[PDB]
Amino acid sequence: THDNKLQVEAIKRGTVIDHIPAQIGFKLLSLFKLTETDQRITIGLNLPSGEMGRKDLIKIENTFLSEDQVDQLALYAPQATVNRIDNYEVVGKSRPSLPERIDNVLVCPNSNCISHAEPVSSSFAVRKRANDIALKCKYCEKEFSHNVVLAN
Amino acid sequence: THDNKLQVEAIKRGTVIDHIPAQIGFKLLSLFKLTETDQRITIGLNLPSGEMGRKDLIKIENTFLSEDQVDQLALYAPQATVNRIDNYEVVGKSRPSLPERIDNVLVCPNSNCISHAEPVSSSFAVRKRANDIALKCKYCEKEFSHNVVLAN
Amino acid sequence: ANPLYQKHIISINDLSRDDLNLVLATAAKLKANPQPELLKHKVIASCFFEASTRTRLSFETSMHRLGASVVGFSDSANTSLGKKGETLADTISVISTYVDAIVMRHPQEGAARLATEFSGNVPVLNAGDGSNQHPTQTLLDLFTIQETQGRLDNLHVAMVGDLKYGRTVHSLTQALAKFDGNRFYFIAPDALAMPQYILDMLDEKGIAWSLHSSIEEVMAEVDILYMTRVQKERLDPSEYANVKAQFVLRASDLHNAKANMKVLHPLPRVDEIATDVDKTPHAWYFQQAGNGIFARQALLALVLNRDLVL
Amino acid sequence: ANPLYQKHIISINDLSRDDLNLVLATAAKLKANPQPELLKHKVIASCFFEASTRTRLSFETSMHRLGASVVGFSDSANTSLGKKGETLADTISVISTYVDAIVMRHPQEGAARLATEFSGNVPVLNAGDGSNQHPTQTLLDLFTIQETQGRLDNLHVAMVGDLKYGRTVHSLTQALAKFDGNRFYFIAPDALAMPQYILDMLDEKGIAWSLHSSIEEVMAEVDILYMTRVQKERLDPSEYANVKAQFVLRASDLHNAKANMKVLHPLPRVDEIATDVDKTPHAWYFQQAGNGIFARQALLALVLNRDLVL
Amino acid sequence: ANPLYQKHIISINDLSRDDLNLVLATAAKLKANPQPELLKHKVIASCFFEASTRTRLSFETSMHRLGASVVGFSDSANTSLGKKGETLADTISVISTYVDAIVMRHPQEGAARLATEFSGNVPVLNAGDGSNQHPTQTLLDLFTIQETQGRLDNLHVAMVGDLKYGRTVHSLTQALAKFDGNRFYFIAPDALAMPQYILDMLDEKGIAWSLHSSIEEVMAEVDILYMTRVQKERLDPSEYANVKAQFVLRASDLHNAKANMKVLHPLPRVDEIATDVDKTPHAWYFQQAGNGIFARQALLALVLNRDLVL
Amino acid sequence: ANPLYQKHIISINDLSRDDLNLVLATAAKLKANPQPELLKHKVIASCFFEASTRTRLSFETSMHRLGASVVGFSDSANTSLGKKGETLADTISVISTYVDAIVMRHPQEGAARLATEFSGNVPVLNAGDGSNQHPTQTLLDLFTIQETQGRLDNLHVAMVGDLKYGRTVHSLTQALAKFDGNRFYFIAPDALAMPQYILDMLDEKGIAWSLHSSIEEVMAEVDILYMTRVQKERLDPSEYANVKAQFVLRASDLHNAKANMKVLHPLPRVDEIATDVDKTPHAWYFQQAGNGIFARQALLALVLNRDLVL
Numbered sequence A, B: 001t002h003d004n005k006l007q008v009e010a011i012k013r014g015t016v017i018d019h020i021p022a023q024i025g026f027k028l029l030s031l032f033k034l035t036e037t038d039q040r041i042t043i044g045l046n047l048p049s050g051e052m053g054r055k056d057l058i059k060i061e062n063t064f065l066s067e068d069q070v071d072q073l074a075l076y077a078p079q080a081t082v083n084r085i086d087n088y089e090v091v092g093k094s095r096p097s098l099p100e101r102i103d104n105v106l107v108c109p110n111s112n113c114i115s116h117a118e119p120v121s122s123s124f125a126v127r128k129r130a131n132d133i134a135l136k137c138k139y140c141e142k143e144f145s146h147n148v149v150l151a152n
Numbered sequence C, D, E, F: 001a002n003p004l005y006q007k008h009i010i011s012i013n014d015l016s017r018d019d020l021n022l023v024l025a026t027a028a029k030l031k032a033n034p035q036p037e038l039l040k041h042k043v044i045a046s047c048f049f050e051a052s053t054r055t056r057l058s059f060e061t062s063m064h065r066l067g068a069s070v071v072g073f074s075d076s077a078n079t080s081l082g083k084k085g086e087t088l089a090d091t092i093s094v095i096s097t098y099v100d101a102i103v104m105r106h107p108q109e110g111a112a113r114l115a116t117e118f119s120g121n122v123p124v125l126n127a128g129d130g131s132n133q134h135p136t137q138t139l140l141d142l143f144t145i146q147e148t149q150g151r152l153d154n155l156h157v158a159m160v161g162d163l164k165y166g167r168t169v170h171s172l173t174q175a176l177a178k179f180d181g182n183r184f185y186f187i188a189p190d191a192l193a194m195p196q197y198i199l200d201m202l203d204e205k206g207i208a209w210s211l212h213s214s215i216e217e218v219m220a221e222v223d224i225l226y227m228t229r230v231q232k233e234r235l236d237p238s239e240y241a242n243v244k245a246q247f248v249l250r251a252s253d254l255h256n257a258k259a260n261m262k263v264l265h266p267l268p269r270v271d272e273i274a275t276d277v278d279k280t281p282h283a284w285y286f287q288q289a290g291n292g293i294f295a296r297q298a299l300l301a302l303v304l305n306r307d308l309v310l
């Protein structure tokens, strides 16, 4: 995270989500239910950074993310760095590529969509445009700007 | 303690909510919006504890909790210890004592309660009985077990 | 200003023994010496989000008996206040810029207290909020008991009917438990028994209470026989048929009743009190309903007139 | 007699700048010095062929604040006036033999003016006729603007919402175009853009107006931010979702707003104005609604009292 | 001719243990060996005086799976085939001249029993009569139990929820009491306890039963966990809130369940069974519903055919 | 097994050009060579959560023309098979255990897509889901076009009326964009213009389209004139008056039409096409409706039979 001396230590086996924009760390913990485990997690919020000034850091021991699970962080922490780690060495390091499909976390801004009252998880087809990402709902088949879907 | 095998570091001033039961640290972060600050925060989940196996721990830097605020954790983390750390010195081992009133974080189990789609803050009067805490709604005026109020 | 000037009247648990006595005292005076102009130039909102003809006419009549003007609505089919979907908060916020006091009945518990947080300087009187409170009914019941019994202390009080759901009986019980030495008799089918929380409250205050399955079990020693309407949807038709006699009163059931005994019922009766009871000196339900006027006048008087002239 | 004595108040296009100023002047006086007996002995009909709780209670309260008696009806399920199928003409013909003034709201455009041709010596005040006129709302809006801004001339006025269908904004626009140097900002999704006929009217009168897609585009320089309710059936649910942010206001959107800026909304809000806005000095919609009383009093006063004592 | 040929199917009380087995034995046969033309040429009436989508679609499908035609009505009725007053007797006297069998659902107890007295030679199949019987729902339940457990004897059966008003839990208990060595566990709050008359029938037959407060208490011993819907439209919202949260089934509760254990529910389940249970192997409510087609086909075939060669 | 065997028919977007032809090729075959026993023994559910007489009768007739039985409901529903809260998911999990295929119409977008996730091995045919899809209406449209024009390539297609909200004009455009060299003419007022996303899809595929203000402008070049109904329940009465009068088709407008030109309308036509058009040879809306039976039979037969020898 560009800094040393007074921070959160390193682990042996697991994943470390680094360079998370400030105020996005907690959101990632919620949205993707990351604390919903027995493994040991360590979090640093509003940590000083050389590059970003400040950022969040998530460390999850004995847990790994597929390249696709990594891409799901694309709409929230696109400049993030996901670090794969075994025997204290950064075995792997990857960054979020915006996915072609986003499940479970978003909700169809369409109030008449069938997805809302129902025991189904949301799902959107992702496709880029000049100034944004277009999100198309699997059910309503309506497409919305990621700015509408993401907003409250 | 369990703070120095690998360093989660020790902070100067602020509070150190310690001895939070497993899977409760995250709730506290949510229900009470603890991450909505710019202060440096460091969380540890499922850390080891000699007297319960695992535990959680929050470190909001240079930010203190009143007498009541600390009592607001009692319903979620009763056998938990808050610490009013002053320049590296643990100066005050407080502890959640059941409050008389619980505001904002609870939801009235009563579906007919006026409180639900209205711009008001929930409010419950607390009291021990058979020891299971009966929670009484300011609006509804109905009383339920903390286990029905808390279920959802 | 009197103790109740500009105060909200949401629950009977917010009123003290002195407050009640104050309302009844005032009620007596108004009953005796009418003040038709007392609230002249006041405009009161009669807000029945939940329709209720007898309570609304009683309240509104009380309003006019004091000289105040009235605006309002009944059975709000949809929302009410520029019908649509706005919050109750917003509805009260607006109506409180128009009136001097708001009297409201609502199907949701809490409604009257919520209105309190948006009404500003405007007092709200709860005419009924779901299965929670109904303070003006208790005040009229209390007034009727005290006037016919001469007191509210050391009384033998029987409550028959749906003790489980009826908010009036819960409310009346608590109000009477603010007075010393009252003795209670709860006659109800166990499926509609008086809640365990009302019994605890009475245990703590050290009040005598017993359960009975028949009116004749205690008829001989009650001062007030308070009957309630047993909601028929509550029960299965056959179930209701099998317990029906437990809570119905006839003229013949009054053979060993004390002379002083009066029968009250918040109405409607029809399924509980036979019409042959009406002609006996014990029937006091219509008189009781009449007393809602003096109790409701007293209340508006106290809340809206700082210096009450009596 | 004053300019408006015994006149009908059907449209804002029938009122002159002097007439408006007259209403507001009177409104101010009544707000300041109440005349509770001014219309004593007058009987006014509150005729809501179309239900509308907030407008009816506002109007009726205004009526009682002046001392007049009221008769009327709401939501005429069927016809109304010996229910059946008679004409509106006949209904007004009869009711005008009973009352001193008729206030009416109707779902059909033209209703208030038609009533005018059958009411005889009885004035009718239009409380709303389909998507046509709503003069008393504009008068209260105008009163609110002038009181908080000190004037009706040279103002920076923003109108947000359903500029296409909302009769209030069309009406308010025209009334303000009777005053000099007002500057308009129309923020609306093109599907609900301000009609071409309102823009022409302003072109001819040489008035400055511009179209914007966001409130923040002009937030920094508006004196009055007039929000409207966007009818949800107007749009497709997904359509409505995609434009929804264009016309919704939050407390944070007010960061660079002028101190003097007030937010108005004829109500109901709920989908356009977040509740965190209520606590800021800019929120003025509930105050605005309160001013409907003084504007409505002024109006009845002027129309029914030949020699207005102030 | 089979024992059920031309017999009415009105009440579980009228059906013997042998009658029960016959029906289940035929249902297993038809399930394995469909006879799509068996009732070819037969016209059956689907008379739902009380609307009932699931039951009616289930019954009607069974009818078609055997090749019969169907005529009928589902009403939520306004005296269907009455006209402000025609008796159910006359409407059955008419319809029994049209069809080969009458399947009917009605809001009043005894309705089907009355029909058999006016349908002559036409069999009457009761699809539900008020709070009395629902014999076919019990046949499909018993079939589901026999098929998944391989027997209707020596079972551990837990029935959870509203045992007081649930007519299906009452019939299932009665039906199971016709077999030997079954043990019942009743999980219900006190307000919805399994009725004393049911408990009296079991005691009187040497059948053991017990009351328990949660499912965890019986889970390890249960073969069939029968969940029933809470007639919430009967309780106070607050009341339904306290009880609900207790007798709700989550997947995790099934951690210690036996491998043969099946979760049944006449449906709709909404607040009683969490959707994560659906994926477990114990979830068998949809399968139970699908079995209503074989239970109902069997019943129809047995009543309309002298002898079946299946 | 054909490409459509056991496949769900939810969206026009999911169907390829080959899928389209297969359906039209089978519909022509069945129209010429009826197979009344093809689906004999199959039971199909006709589930109209949203009432729809024309569509339902059309679908149900198709079902019977192939010999299948039908069960279902048309509701204008009060949570049909829900009871204040059962999910559409559970009602499909039940029904898919009863029938061989589910035909459903629902007011919410995505409803049919959700059903396929709970119907297991039972195919789901979408008969309309809110403002999203209506694939079978497009198949019958395309069949009518192919049959009267002999192709779905190189056509001149004018679509008139409400292009903004019409889901059928959106699907027809999308479907036709799967073929080559078609040219579209869109005649609509600005408030109801064909959406930009549709125009973007065409631009993006090299398909030419143009906007015109009247039918006279395109008449001489048009092969298929597709009229759509104005969702008038969306506009102001005045507004609907101005636009209506423009985009109405009279017989005289067809003076210069080509001999092969056909007028189509999903119906109901009421204000859009004058009855004197009905007698002209171009009038083909009734014929189009009749073709819904062959389009729908094809669809059913392809989904339920591995291979058809027609």
Ligand SMILES: Nc1ccn([C@@H]2O[C@H](COP(=O)(O)OP(=O)(O)OP(=O)(O)O)[C@@H](O)[C@H]2O)c(=O)n1
Binding pocket: A001, A002, A009, A010, A011, A012, A016, A018, A059, A081, A083, A085, A087, A088, A089, A090, A093
């Ligand atoms: N066993 C380890 C090893 C590394 N880390 C953390 O994961 C990141 C690894 O960074 P590093 O491999 O040292 O490369 P950097 O210098 O951080 O550059 P970059 O962040 O771009 O990879 C740092 O936050 C480090 O503290 C850890 O938690 N446990």
Ligand SMILES: Nc1ccn([C@@H]2O[C@H](COP(=O)(O)OP(=O)(O)OP(=O)(O)O)[C@@H](O)[C@H]2O)c(=O)n1
Binding pocket: B001, B002, B003, B009, B010, B011, B012, B016, B018, B057, B059, B081, B083, B085, B087, B088, B089, B090, B093
């Ligand atoms: N400057 C400091 C001082 C203390 N702590 C934290 O305060 C908590 C409690 O420390 P302390 O009460 O001094 O000793 P313990 O053994 O942890 O107390 P207990 O037995 O109650 O856990 C530990 O998480 C310790 O890391 C901290 O974060 N920064």
Ligand SMILES: O=C(CP(=O)(O)O)Nc1cccc(NC(=O)CP(=O)(O)O)c1
Binding pocket: C052, C053, C054, C055, C056, C128, C134, C137, C165, C166, C167, C168, C169, C227, C228, C229, C230, C265, C266, C267, C268
């Ligand atoms: O006389 C009244 C008031 P009204 O019928 O609304 O005029 N009784 C009343 C009003 C509102 C609620 C209740 N609730 C009760 O439990 C009393 P009951 O069951 O006897 O009507 C009782």
Ligand SMILES: O=C(CP(=O)(O)O)Nc1cccc(NC(=O)CP(=O)(O)O)c1
Binding pocket: C081, C082, C083, D052, D053, D054, D055, D056, D128, D134, D137, D165, D166, D167, D168, D169, D227, D228, D229, D230, D265, D266, D267, D268
């Ligand atoms: O506050 C009011 C009057 P009320 O809701 O009838 O009490 N607004 C009102 C009344 C009647 C019509 C309209 N029409 C509008 O276009 C204003 P909006 O769309 O904001 O309600 C607005």
Ligand SMILES: O=C(CP(=O)(O)O)Nc1cccc(NC(=O)CP(=O)(O)O)c1
Binding pocket: E051, E052, E053, E054, E055, E056, E057, E134, E137, E165, E166, E167, E168, E169, E228, E229, E266, E267, E268, F083
């Ligand atoms: O709403 C329904 C579906 P319907 O029978 O088609 O009306 N209820 C229904 C359907 C089938 C069986 C049952 N069985 C019951 O026991 C009804 P409950 O549990 O509500 O008393 C209940």
Ligand SMILES: O=C(CP(=O)(O)O)Nc1cccc(NC(=O)CP(=O)(O)O)c1
Binding pocket: F051, F052, F053, F054, F055, F056, F057, F134, F137, F165, F166, F167, F168, F169, F228, F229, F266, F267, F268
């Ligand atoms: O009212 C009807 C008949 P229904 O489908 O049987 O409900 N409408 C209907 C029927 C068949 C097809 C269509 N097609 C449409 O495009 C409906 P619209 O043009 O109103 O959006 C619409």
Ligand SMILES: [Zn+2]
Binding pocket: A108, A109, A110, A113, A114, A115, A137, A138, A139, A140, A141, A142, F110
């Ligand atoms: Zn959607």
Ligand SMILES: [Zn+2]
Binding pocket: B108, B109, B110, B113, B114, B115, B137, B138, B139, B140, B141, B142, C110
């Ligand atoms: Zn509540």
